[PDB]
Design a binder for these strands. Structure first.
Length: 50
DNA sequence: CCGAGTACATGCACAGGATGTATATATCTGACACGTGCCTGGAGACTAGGGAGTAATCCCCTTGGCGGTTAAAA
């Protein structure tokens, strides 16, 4: 929220995938758009997201 | 000479990730699907005629039922 008045880029590094899923479920209710990068999605979807 | 301990090696377990799998979906197309009238081979109704098998007896063989003997089953 302090960075919201700033408006820079924020990246989250999580070792556990379940914490990334819970981070997407928690960030979805905050109306904050983001994307998840893991070893799950195909290189095409990761290439489009990148 | 023996015991304690530190160090190196190792093995097992967990988590990530890649690849195989299977179903959900999309779409244009051969083929079921559906009128439109034809008609001619069928399908049935209506008299008349035929006929073979059902039904009842009844005579007559072929079954099913008695006691031993050894031969085959055990």
């Amino acid at each position: 929220t302090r960075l919201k008045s700033q408006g820079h880029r924020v990246l989250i590094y999580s070792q556990m995938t379940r914490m990334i899923d819970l981070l997407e479920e928690y960030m979805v209710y905050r109306k904050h758009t983001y994307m998840r990068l893991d070893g799950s999605s195909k290189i095409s979807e990761r290439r489009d997201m990148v």
